[PDB]
Amino acid sequence: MNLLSDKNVAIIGGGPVGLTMAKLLQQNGIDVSVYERDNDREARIFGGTLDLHKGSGQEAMKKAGLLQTYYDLALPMGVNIADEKGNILSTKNVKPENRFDNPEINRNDLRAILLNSLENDTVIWDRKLVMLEPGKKKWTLTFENKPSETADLVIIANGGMSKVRKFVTDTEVEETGTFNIQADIHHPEVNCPGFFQLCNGNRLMAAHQGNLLFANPNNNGALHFGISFKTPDEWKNTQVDFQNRNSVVDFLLKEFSDWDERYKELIRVTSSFVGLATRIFPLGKSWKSKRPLPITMIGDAAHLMPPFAGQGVNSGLMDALILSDNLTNGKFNSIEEAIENYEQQMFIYGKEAQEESTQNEIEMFKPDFTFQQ
Numbered sequence: 001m002n003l004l005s006d007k008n009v010a011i012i013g014g015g016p017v018g019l020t021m022a023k024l025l026q027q028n029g030i031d032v033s034v035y036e037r038d039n040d041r042e043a044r045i046f047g048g049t050l051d052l053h054k055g056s057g058q059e060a061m062k063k064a065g066l067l068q069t070y071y072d073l074a075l076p077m078g079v080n081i082a083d084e085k086g087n088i089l090s091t092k093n094v095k096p097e098n099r100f101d102n103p104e105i106n107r108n109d110l111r112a113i114l115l116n117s118l119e120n121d122t123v124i125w126d127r128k129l130v131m132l133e134p135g136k137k138k139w140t141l142t143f144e145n146k147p148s149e150t151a152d153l154v155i156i157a158n159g160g161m162s163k164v165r166k167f168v169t170d171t172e173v174e175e176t177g178t179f180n181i182q183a184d185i186h187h188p189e190v191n192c193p194g195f196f197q198l199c200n201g202n203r204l205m206a207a208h209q210g211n212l213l214f215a216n217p218n219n220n221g222a223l224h225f226g227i228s229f230k231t232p233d234e235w236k237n238t239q240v241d242f243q244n245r246n247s248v249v250d251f252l253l254k255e256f257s258d259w260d261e262r263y264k265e266l267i268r269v270t271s272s273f274v275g276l277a278t279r280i281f282p283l284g285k286s287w288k289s290k291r292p293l294p295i296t297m298i299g300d301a302a303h304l305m306p307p308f309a310g311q312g313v314n315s316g317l318m319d320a321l322i323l324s325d326n327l328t329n330g331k332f333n334s335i336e337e338a339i340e341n342y343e344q345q346m347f348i349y350g351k352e353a354q355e356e357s358t359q360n361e362i363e364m365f366k367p368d369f370t371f372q373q
């Protein structure tokens with residue numbers, strides 16, 4: 001019959017994009033396994049919420065039959081812009097006509113939606129892919145301290161830091177020159193009451209002198225905030241130890257010195273911080289043209305970009321929707337031609353998304369930016 005009849009697909013990485021790719025193939029009768037580094041699905045995913053947009057992220061969920069399950073676990077949320085003094089400068093609340101536009105979902109809820117939709121044993125846990133080798137017809141996959149597997153098609157979906165890209169591209173991940181510190185506060189109504197009342201059930205964003213603060217007061221009962229700034233030149237080839245909360249507190253309280261005490265309370269009561277340099281996997285010249293066997297990349301492994309334009313997962317789920325339709329629609333003469341068609345479209349929307357990310361990033365970290373239009 002079709003391109004993948006009597007063939008199996010290996011997806012590397014069980015993030016939202018890989019699991020979506022698995023669902024869209026599996027529901028067309030395709031033999032697909034997902035190899036995920038993580039030991040069990042009972043592991044907290046650290047991060048904020050994700051919003052699926054109409055026409056991209058939501059299309060993927062709709063084609064999968066999971067769009068209602070997403071709406072049931074997602075939460076529409078307004079945005080408040082505030083100054084460093086705790087003045088609300090602007091309050092965009094959720095008009096009921098727009099409540100389906102991009103409601104926020106917890107990363108563990110999205111993962112659980114996608115896992116429950118797959119056949120038992122679709123995802124193989126504790127499988128860290130370390131290397132690929134193409135045979136005559138099949139790839140051999142090598143995992144850390146676990147037996148090898150084979151596949152006719154490999155889809156790299158294992159995130160922005162993937163080390164298994166080289167059969168697709170020699171493109172290297174780059175630092176953009178911004179740095180992000182993320183943290184969670186449990187029971188924020190009790191533990192950061194001032195900042196919680198400032199948020200007032202809305203997301204909050206504030207900018208003063210090249211420091212940006214973002215918060216969501218309701219990621220499944222926890223408040224999630226991030227502080228972003230131009231990487232201090234001091235930290236060329238980090239003078240802050242992120243395992244030492246006292247060191248991060250001391251750095252942040254100096255940087256936030258002229259901010260209202262409701263923001264400094266955030267910094268003071270945070271049990272642990274996570275620091276990460278902003279990185280991009282730049283889409284430039286095309287990828288390797290003549291690969292030994294069929295292989296491609298979707299999600300952050302394809303187009304990792306700064307998280308400043310609300311884009312990221314949406315272009316990933318668009319990757320999964322286009323590749324899965326190309327592999328299953330009957331229109332292509334080979335797996336290679338289905339892949340080429342996916343990559344050619346992804347290079348267009350992906351270059352646009354990356355350009356918008358990089359532009360927002362340049363603008364937002366002028367030493368004199370405020371969210372004010």
Ligand SMILES: Cc1cc2c(cc1C)N(C[C@H](O)[C@H](O)[C@H](O)COP(=O)(O)OP(=O)(O)OC[C@H]1O[C@@H](n3cnc4c(N)ncnc43)[C@H](O)[C@@H]1O)c1[nH]c(=O)[nH]c(=O)c1N2
Pocket residue numbers: 012013014015016017018035036037038047048049050051127128129130157158159160162180182298299300301307310311312313314316
């Ligand atoms: C601080 C911050 C904040 C945001 C965002 C990023 C960052 C850094 N993003 C971007 C968004 O998080 C991102 O686009 C998606 O997580 C990408 O999904 P993927 O499944 O491609 O990768 P993701 O990285 O989520 O998943 C990769 C998976 O592969 C696994 N893995 C890694 N190496 C492996 C190996 N060798 N073998 C097997 N498994 C392996 C990992 O364990 C993980 O499960 C975002 N986006 C958005 O739309 N809205 C937002 O608000 C934000 N906010």
Ligand SMILES: C[NH+](C)c1cc(NC(=O)CNC(C)(C)C)c(O)c2c1C[C@H]1C[C@H]3[C@H]([NH+](C)C)C(O)=C(C(N)=O)C(=O)[C@@]3(O)C(O)=C1C2=O
Pocket residue numbers: 048180182203205214215216224225226227228307308309310311360
């Ligand atoms: C420019 N800022 C205001 C922005 C814009 C958009 N959307 C757009 O620009 C798209 N606008 C169109 C639809 C094209 C008209 C955005 O979509 C976003 C954001 C902000 C980011 C902030 C992210 C932040 N990061 C740096 C880690 C963060 O910590 C939080 C948080 N703790 O709540 C975020 O909210 C953040 O992850 C995020 O999701 C942002 C946006 O979604």
